[PDB]
Amino acid sequence: YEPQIITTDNTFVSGNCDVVIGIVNNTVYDPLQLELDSFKE
Amino acid sequence: NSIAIPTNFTISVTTEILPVSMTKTSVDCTMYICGDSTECSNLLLQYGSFCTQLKRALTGIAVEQDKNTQEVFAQVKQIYKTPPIKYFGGFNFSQILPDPSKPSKRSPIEDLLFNKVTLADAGFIKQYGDCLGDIAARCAQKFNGLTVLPPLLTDEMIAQYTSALLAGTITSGWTFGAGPALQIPFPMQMAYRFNGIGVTQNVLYENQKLIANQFNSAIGKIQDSLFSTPSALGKLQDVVNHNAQALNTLVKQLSSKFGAISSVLNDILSRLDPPEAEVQIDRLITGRLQSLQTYVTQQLIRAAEIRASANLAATKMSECVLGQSKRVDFCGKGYHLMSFPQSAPHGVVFLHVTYVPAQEKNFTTAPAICHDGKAHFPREGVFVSNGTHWFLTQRNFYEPQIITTDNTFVSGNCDVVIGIVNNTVYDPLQLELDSFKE
Amino acid sequence: VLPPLLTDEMIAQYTSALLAGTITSGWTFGAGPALQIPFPMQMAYRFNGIGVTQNVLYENQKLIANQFNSAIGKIQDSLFSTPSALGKLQDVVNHNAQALNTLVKQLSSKFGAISSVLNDILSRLDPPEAEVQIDRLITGRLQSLQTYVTQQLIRAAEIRASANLAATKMSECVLGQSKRVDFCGKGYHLMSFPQSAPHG
Amino acid sequence: NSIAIPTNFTISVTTEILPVSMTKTSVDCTMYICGDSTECSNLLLQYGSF
Amino acid sequence: VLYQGVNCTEVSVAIHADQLTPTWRVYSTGSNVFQTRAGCLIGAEYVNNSYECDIPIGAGICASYQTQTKSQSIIAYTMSLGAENSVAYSN
Ligand SMILES: *[C@@H]1O[C@H](CO)[C@@H](O[C@@H]2O[C@H](CO)[C@@H](O[C@@H]3O[C@H](CO)[C@@H](O)[C@H](O)[C@@H]3O)[C@H](O)[C@H]2NC(C)=O)[C@H](O)[C@H]1NC(C)=O
Ligand SMILES: *[C@@H]1O[C@H](CO)[C@@H](O[C@@H]2O[C@H](CO)[C@@H](O[C@@H]3O[C@H](CO)[C@@H](O)[C@H](O)[C@@H]3O)[C@H](O)[C@H]2NC(C)=O)[C@H](O)[C@H]1NC(C)=O
Ligand SMILES: *[C@@H]1O[C@H](CO)[C@@H](O[C@@H]2O[C@H](CO)[C@@H](O)[C@H](O)[C@H]2NC(C)=O)[C@H](O)[C@H]1NC(C)=O
Ligand SMILES: *[C@@H]1O[C@H](CO)[C@@H](O[C@@H]2O[C@H](CO)[C@@H](O)[C@H](O)[C@H]2NC(C)=O)[C@H](O)[C@H]1NC(C)=O
Ligand SMILES: *[C@@H]1O[C@H](CO)[C@@H](O[C@@H]2O[C@H](CO)[C@@H](O)[C@H](O)[C@H]2NC(C)=O)[C@H](O)[C@H]1NC(C)=O
Ligand SMILES: *[C@@H]1O[C@H](CO)[C@@H](O)[C@H](O)[C@H]1NC(C)=O
Ligand SMILES: *[C@@H]1O[C@H](CO)[C@@H](O)[C@H](O)[C@H]1NC(C)=O
Ligand SMILES: *[C@@H]1O[C@H](CO)[C@@H](O)[C@H](O)[C@H]1NC(C)=O
Ligand SMILES: *[C@@H]1O[C@H](CO)[C@@H](O)[C@H](O)[C@H]1NC(C)=O
Ligand SMILES: *[C@@H]1O[C@H](CO)[C@@H](O)[C@H](O)[C@H]1NC(C)=O
């Protein structure tokens, strides 16, 4: 057991939120999107 | 440049049958050679420790068979139970799990396996029977000194080990086999087994109903295949028949004369005075000694064969049922996903669940893509072309993806790779960072 | 002596089929339909399987091919030059010949009888004495047959174990890639090729 | 703090030789013990199923 | 002592008639005679409690030497296979 933040570097994307049985709603944090926002402002 | 890649798959269940144990025999030396005859027994004593050697050999065999059964089935430290819901993602295990409604608490498949095999000995107390039969019908019927010992583990107690093992693997996968049993949802155990054979988890989750239906159909096919084919359980019937034949031969040898006037010891003692009777008895003793040594030698050789088979069965249980094995053809034909044991008389039957590619299509491939003067190689998978565009796919399942800098790695220029082709290798950060300002 | 059920041509056909499957499709034909893959890409997979990236193979592909051709030539020269390499199979033949020759030689043994020839026993002795001498020869010959069969059963068990090991090697070395150290030869396993041999 | 890493490699081919089968034999028990002898065969019958 | 292949009734009758070839006898009272699948076991008290197998007898029946009630004796029992552990499986 070693919990980490769920990000787009830890997971991969295939398909939409329908076919998977038991999918749950949670935020996946993009590393770049946060960084890009810091680059802007 | 052509590579064929599966576009579909079938979940297949196959059956492997292995002997684990052989009937545990016991031979009564005095009764066989010198049945109820003091003079013959006294002559028999002049050959020394021969019986004692036979007794040790047969005791060692009986113990070895109990050892083989214990090693094969008693590999779990706790008896695991299944949940009362019996819902595992839509997978139907009613044909492999114990049926609570019938005596012995065996699975549908186990009762079929037990009904198919005919047991000639079925050791238990038989003295109560005595006569009133049409004929005695045996394999000595005890009377000539040859008996069969019961196993230490009963058929119900083997079924309990099988149930514990099935409950363990179904509810915790391979975790309990290497320490404590950790519960996991079944689709997540199978998804990890899929990862084990090189196919991603999303393939299983997207097609979960298809996979469950293929599994359930394959199990039904196993039940029908075993029911329909009377010779499916060949190896176990052969073991039973060989032990029955060895005992039938050993008893029938008692009717031979081996050079004596008569095969009946009491006739020799009745007709002749001691000094001649001793010679006729010595001839019969020699013949019986040869028959007993032949019988024991064959039982020891067969015991060694059974030991090797039992060791293989225990090895398969550990690597196929309590784990996942990457050894080809070890756990059935195809890529191994999981296995389920079933009890059978004198042995074990394994149901091996494998992933088999189906409906392949041939695409054009290339070792690498040259972009800005650099050779891009896959991190995982292979490159394919549908004739107009290049994609990255998995080796075991067609799934086209855009070739990007997050999926490939770069090493060296494009001049060194013999089969390299020209295609655009996208870079997600650059398009957005170029998108970010301009 | 009974012939084998599968003739040498049939064994050669199985070996050829296994080589064609392995070369054209690698490990694929042992677990689904055979799927063609370019050989250098099959090797790239195998290299990744042993922890070596695909670019090592591709940058040095001609070095690897030359080392392969040299090693195969060395195998042919090694087997030709050293007759003892195949001793494991030659012993199987030689032991069998010895066992059969021994059993025949046992017919000349007297086992305590005045003569080894049944016709001599019957010609010179009255039935009673001839019966005693013949019964003795029968006992000696039965003992020789029991010894021969017991030895054949023990060797059969040894051959069975060897055949089971060979079957495991075919499935794991030829029809796949093994991670068992020194199972499929010394070094990290890349691939194997079967060849038929008499009795093995 | 010292680690050795290969800078080159060799592709090696080795040979493993395994027996698969033995010569299949068959024995005529009566002919071997009592070849072309009626009297011997008649005594051989007293040894039963051997 | 385990008498293989026979009924306990037959053994008790042979004992009362003094027809058995061994000249020794095992002291026998009620509760000390237990019918097994292997044969008739005389000289061990059968109990309901299962335990790990120590001295195997056969057909699931094992025996051991243990302190009972308040007094050590040989007992016979049905073999225990292990502790029960129900896995908390959930979706
Ligand atoms: C898991 O699979 C088993 C079969 O492998 C399912 O049991 C089957 O259930 C159906 C419907 O309840 C049974 O059909 C009915 O059978 C009776 C027999 O008398 C018949 O009269 C009815 O008209 C109907 O045909 C089927 O026989 C039965 N099979 C067995 C072997 O029990 C079980 O329901 C499945 N469970 C889940 C959760 O999917
Ligand atoms: C890694 O090792 C291999 C050998 O296992 C190196 O390749 C070998 O390099 C030598 C020297 O360049 C070659 O020797 C030369 O061969 C030619 C053949 O005509 C001969 O005329 C020369 O006189 C000399 O003997 C050798 O053949 C070659 N082997 C192969 C199979 O190509 C390789 O360069 C090494 N790599 C590194 C990075 O050290
Ligand atoms: C996860 O979030 C999505 C929305 O992004 C949810 O989908 C909505 O669910 C409500 C339920 O009342 C519907 O009325 C909406 O029409 C749905 N919208 C869409 C776009 O599908 C989804 O239900 C959420 N899942 C969970 C488990 O909370
Ligand atoms: C090869 O794949 C590409 C992309 O998957 C195909 O092109 C797409 O075709 C769909 C219609 O099926 C269009 O909606 C997309 O806009 C197309 N994308 C591009 C980038 O062209 C292409 O047709 C496929 N070719 C073959 C022979 O299968
Ligand atoms: C991939 O593209 C490069 C250019 O980006 C090609 O390189 C050119 O090849 C032609 C001959 O085909 C030469 O005349 C040019 O001088 C080359 N230019 C450079 C910059 O290398 C390369 O040949 C292409 N490869 C394929 C397989 O089409
Ligand atoms: C695909 O396989 C079939 C097999 O008959 C072959 O005829 C066809 O040419 C192949 N196509 C490609 C592109 O390799
Ligand atoms: C794969 O085969 C199954 C067989 O039932 C079928 O239902 C499914 O649609 C097939 N999928 C594809 C992508 O061909
Ligand atoms: C012993 O004999 C009785 C006679 O009624 C019988 O009921 C019982 O089943 C027998 N036991 C065995 C083990 O045969
Ligand atoms: C075992 O338990 C059953 C329960 O009904 C009982 O009848 C039986 O007498 C018990 N045996 C012993 C030896 O206590
Ligand atoms: C699991 O899902 C099934 C869906 O039919 C449901 O019936 C069952 O009660 C669920 N179990 C748990 C523990 O949530």
Author numbering:
A (entry chain A): 1110 to 1150
B (entry chain B): 710 to 847, 851 to 1150
C (entry chain C): 860 to 1059
D (entry chain C): 710 to 759
E (entry chain A): 610 to 679, 689 to 709
The authors write:
The JN.1-sublineage KP.3.1.1 recently emerged as the globally prevalent SARS-CoV-2 variant, demonstrating increased infectivity and antibody escape. We investigate how mutations and a deletion in the KP.3.1.1 spike protein (S) affect hACE2 binding and antibody escape. To investigate the effects of N30 glycosylation introduced by S31Δ and two RBD mutations (F456L and Q493E) on the structure and function of the spike protein, we determined the cryo-EM structures of the recent SARS-CoV-2 variants KP.3.1.1 and JN.1.11 along with engineered variants JN.1.11 + S31Δ+Q493E, JN.1.11.1 + S31Δ, and JN.1.11 + S31Δ. The spike proteins exhibited three conformational states: “one RBD up,” “all RBD down,” and “flexible” (i.e., one or two RBDs disordered in the density maps due to flexibility).
JN.1.11 is JN.1 plus V1104L, and JN.1.11.1 is JN.1.11 plus F456L. In addition, to dissect how the mutations S31Δ, F456L, and Q493E affect the overall spike stability, we introduced these mutations into the JN.1.11 spike protein. Additionally, we also determined apo spike protein structures of engineered JN.1-derived mutants carrying S31Δ, F456L, and Q493E. Through biochemical and structural analysis by mass spectrometry and cryo-EM, we demonstrated that the S31 deletion enabled N-glycosylation at N30 and caused a 180° flip of the side chain of the adjacent F32 residue. Our results demonstrated that S31Δ indeed induces a fully glycan-occupied N30 glycosylation site in all of the variants carrying the S31 deletion, including JN.1.11 + S31Δ, JN.1.11.1 + S31Δ, JN.1.11 + Q493E + S31Δ, and KP.3.1.1. The N30 site (NxT motif) was found to be predominantly occupied with high-mannose glycans. Similarly, JN.1.11 + S31Δ, JN.1.11.1 + S31Δ, and JN.1.11 + Q493E + S31Δ also shared similar NTD structures with KP.3.1.1. Using 3D variability analysis, we quantified the particle proportion for each conformational state and found that S31Δ did not affect the proportions of “one RBD up” and “all RBD down” particles by comparing the proportion of JN.1.11 and other spike proteins that have S31Δ. The data from three paired variant sets (JN.1.11 & JN.1.11 + S31Δ, JN.1.11.1 & JN.1.11.1 + S31Δ, and JN.1.11 + Q493E & JN.1.11 + Q493E + S31Δ) showed that S31Δ has little impact on hACE2 binding, which is consistent with previous studies. This result is also concordant with our observation that S31Δ and the resulting N30 glycosylation do not interfere with the up/down configuration of the spike RBD, where the up conformation of the RBD is required for binding to hACE2.
